[PDB]
Design a protein around this ligand. Structure first.
Ligand SMILES: O=P(O)(O)OC[C@H]1O[C@@H](O)[C@H](O)[C@@H](O)[C@@H]1O
Ligand SMILES: [Mg+2]
Ligand SMILES: [Mg+2]
Length: 218
């Protein structure tokens, strides 16, 4: 049986992937880049704040000063932080709270593997911090998603091998990070976006301990 579950946050625990998208789009448009639509944004999910800005700039072949780059990333984060102030426990995605209770029941470790620096604030907003055995700090890993390091670190933090862990993720970058860590990915979203080669569910109600069950056993 698997011994840990490694959770992405944005788009898995709650609908904050939508907020990051709206904030990145607004920022891109402020600098004249209009190509951040939902399809492009699939490239930004699970990517770090600086990496995301760089992808947006690269899409446009745009160069900015180092001072401007720093201000832009800060500008987007300040906007996103305002956007998330009223997130509450009512915003937890369906299935998630029960999954956390069911896992703790069954002595299965729970770790956060979010690229977001705002993750601990969000778990507090949703009254979920007490479910987590560890939160992997994304500032502490040398490489961000799609590198596997955050997932490896999360598994480590709870004393469980990545090979004995399931990783939940809504993004292309994150699914790749889970594959490369040795953990078993179960994505949430559209196969059109996330692939036909792993188990993908349409929404988080599917993330039951029974199903993780089911998938692990094969
Ligand atoms: O800017 P933050 O909060 O540190 O978030 C970094 C990243 O966190 C990830 O969880 C999101 O999928 C990305 O969209 C986001 O860019
Ligand atoms: Mg995500
Ligand atoms: Mg605690």
């Amino acid at each position: 049986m698997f011994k840990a579950v490694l959770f992405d946050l944005d788009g898995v625990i709650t609908d904050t992937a939508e907020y990051h998208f709206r904030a990145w789009k607004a920022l891109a448009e402020e600098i004249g880049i209009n190509g951040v639509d939902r399809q492009f944004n699939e490239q930004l999910k699970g990517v770090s704040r600086e990496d995301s800005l760089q992808k947006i700039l690269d899409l446009a072949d745009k160069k900015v000063s180092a001072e401007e780059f720093k201000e832009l990333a800060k500008r987007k984060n300040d906007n996103y932080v305002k956007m998330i102030q009223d997130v509450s426990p009512a915003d937890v995605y369906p299935g998630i709270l029960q999954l956390l209770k069911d896992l703790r029941s069954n002595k299965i470790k729970i770790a956060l593997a979010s690229a977001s620096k705002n993750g601990p604030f969000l778990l507090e907003r949703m009254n979920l911090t007490g479910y987590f055995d560890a939160i992997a700090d994304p500032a502490e890993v040398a490489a961000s998603k799609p590198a596997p390091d955050i997932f490896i670190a999360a598994a480590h933090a709870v004393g469980v091998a990545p090979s004995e862990s399931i990783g939940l993720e809504d993004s292309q970058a994150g699914i790749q990070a889970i594959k490369d860590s040795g953990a078993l990915p179960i994505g949430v979203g559209r196969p059109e976006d996330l692939g036909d080669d792993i188990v993908i569910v349409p929404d988080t109600s599917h993330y039951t301990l029974e199903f993780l069950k089911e998938v692990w056993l094969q």
